[PDB]
Amino acid sequence: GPLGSPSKTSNTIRVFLPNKQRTVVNVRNGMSLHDCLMKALKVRGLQPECCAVFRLLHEHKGKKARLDWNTDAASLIGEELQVDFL
Numbered sequence: 001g002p003l004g005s006p007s008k009t010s011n012t013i014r015v016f017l018p019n020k021q022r023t024v025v026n027v028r029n030g031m032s033l034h035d036c037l038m039k040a041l042k043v044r045g046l047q048p049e050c051c052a053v054f055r056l057l058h059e060h061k062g063k064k065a066r067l068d069w070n071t072d073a074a075s076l077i078g079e080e081l082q083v084d085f086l
Contacts, residue, residue, distance in 0.1 A: 001055060001057060001076075001079055001080065003071075003075075003076040003079065004076060005075075005077075006077070006078035007077075007078050010077045010078050011026060011027040011028075011074070011077060012024045012025060012026055012027055012077065013025055013027070013033055013036065013073055013077065013078075013079055013080075013081065014079075014080045014081065015037070015040065015081055015082075015083060016056070016080075016081070016082040016083065017044070017083065018083070018084060018085065021044075023040060023044070025037060025039060025040055025073075026039070027073055027074045027077055028074070029074055030072065030074060031072075031073045031074050032069060032070070032071065032072065032073050033067060033069060033071070033073040033079070033081060034048055034067075034069035035048075035069075035073070036073055037083075046083075050085065050086060051083050051084065051085045051086060052083070052084060052085075052086050053067050053081045053082055053083040053084055054066055054067065054081075054082060054084065055067055055079065055080055055081055055082070056080060056081075056082045057080055067081055
C-alpha cells in the first residue's frame, strides 16, 4: 500500500484470519503490526512467530507483497494485512 498517515483518527489495523474470520488490532504509540497480534493469538490461540503475511487490497495488482514487521504499525495505521502460516 501507500504506508503513511491516512484518515483523521485511526489507531487499529485490519487483519484477515485463514479460518474465514477477520480481526483488527489496536494501536498504542510505537506498536508494530506483528507485535500487536500477541493480543490476537492469545485470545484465538494463534502463533505470530509461526505466521507470516502479505498485503491484499480491493484495488488488485496481480503481484504479491511482503510486510515489514520491523516497521511502525502506528506510523502506517490504515493498512491491510492477511496472515498466512509458514
